Design a protein around this ligand. Structure first.
Ligand SMILES: [Zn+2]
Ligand SMILES: [Zn+2]
Ligand SMILES: [Zn+2]
Ligand SMILES: [Zn+2]
Ligand SMILES: [Zn+2]
Ligand SMILES: [Zn+2]
Lengths: 223, 223
């Protein structure tokens, strides 16, 4: 667990690389925070570019963001993805890696109210992370269903997600059928869950939904 | 077509009754507007109490509201409702009555950018009205599907709804199955449609969704 690295102080958004060694694996990460001076909240960003865009907007609201790379045109739509996921340690390794990353950030920066943001592979990772780590106080999830590569893990752990959730689906998602996505949303344990569905393909979440929408939701709900 | 009636000037929200004679029927209405002094937008409120609550919030944003009574524990869940609807002239009469009501308000108050708000019977009426009257620039609809008493009319006219739409459904709605609701949302012609689904029964739309959510949506989208 150590920093490096690394980026500047002016624009207003600082960026610092870090790296972890967990259960045999080397796990690269990035931390985004305000240039000056302090930030009282944190969001973990799961992905498989839009994550840097979301991180910039969050920092603008006083919210730091952190991302590690996972077992990764969406990566989840590639024929080789299943083997990529299994060779990366699957859901167990993801849980472990994210727990170690958050431990590191809390030691270095102070424990803060923490949320999750992540779609597609970001939900393959985020739904198990939020189920497993009760430091996650709110989650934005989406673009994922029960026929995913770790569908069994998601079905098993969905009932253990007990914090507030906003879930996004795409009506015409060519990678995740609407019914498979509905089924996973249904299995989420929390009563404080809302589902937003928009027309279009997997990559076509409306930008006002992906950006303003998710950022306002986390800003309001993360306390 | 004539006013009466009638309510006051202070609180900040004025209320004026009116009455219409349309195709043989007598149609009662209400108009809500700011006490002082002018209002540049209008929303039509369809229902089968929450409508007065929504009207108050809209007026607070500078938006007038108007409601007429339709062919009406939700009325749509009563065994006698189908006969009530047919005896009231069904969808044709609803279209006619709403067109005449809006004509009246535009003559008396000036034509303004106009939206629709209405759930359940408010969507049985609102989806055909919005399809038929292109003065409707945005619609909030919900709690209704293709197995409704006028399901055939809704399926037929949904493709002709071409303005922006936010649609609400309740996951555990005992009057409208989630699949029947999904099916109707799918048939809406507009590409600028979004579906919000929340847990719970027919009467249990979260208040932040029903009030702040719908009011912010109309305020932003009605131009
Ligand atoms: Zn990346
Ligand atoms: Zn695609
Ligand atoms: Zn949304
Ligand atoms: Zn009434
Ligand atoms: Zn009920
Ligand atoms: Zn909503």
């Amino acid at each position: 667990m150590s920093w490096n690295g690394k980026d500047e102080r002016k624009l207003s958004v600082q960026e610092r690389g870090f790296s972890l060694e967990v259960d045999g694996r080397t796990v690269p990460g990035v931390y985004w925070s305000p240039a000056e001076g302090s930030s009282d909240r944190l969001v973990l960003l799961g992905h498989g570019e839009y994550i840097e865009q979301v991180a910039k907007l969050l920092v603008g609201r006083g919210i730091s963001a952190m991302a590690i790379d996972g077992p990764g045109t969406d990566v989840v739509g590639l024929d080789a993805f299943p083997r990529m996921w299994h060779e990366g340690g699957g859901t167990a390794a993801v849980i472990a890696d994210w727990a170690a990353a958050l431990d590191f950030i809390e030691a270095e920066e102070g424990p803060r109210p923490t949320g999750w943001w992540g779609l597609s592979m970001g939900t393959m990772m985020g739904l198990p992370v939020t189920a497993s780590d009760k430091r996650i106080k709110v989650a934005l999830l989406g673009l994922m269903g029960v026929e995913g590569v770790n569908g069994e893990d998601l079905v098993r752990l969905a009932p253990q997600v007990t914090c507030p959730v906003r879930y996004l689906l795409q009506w015409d998602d060519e990678l995740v059928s609407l019914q498979s996505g509905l089924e996973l949303f249904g299995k989420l344990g929390t009563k404080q869950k809302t589902l937003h569905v928009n027309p279009g393909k997997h990559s076509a979440v409306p930008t006002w939904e992906m950006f303003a929408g998710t950022v306002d939701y986390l800003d309001q709900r993360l306390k």
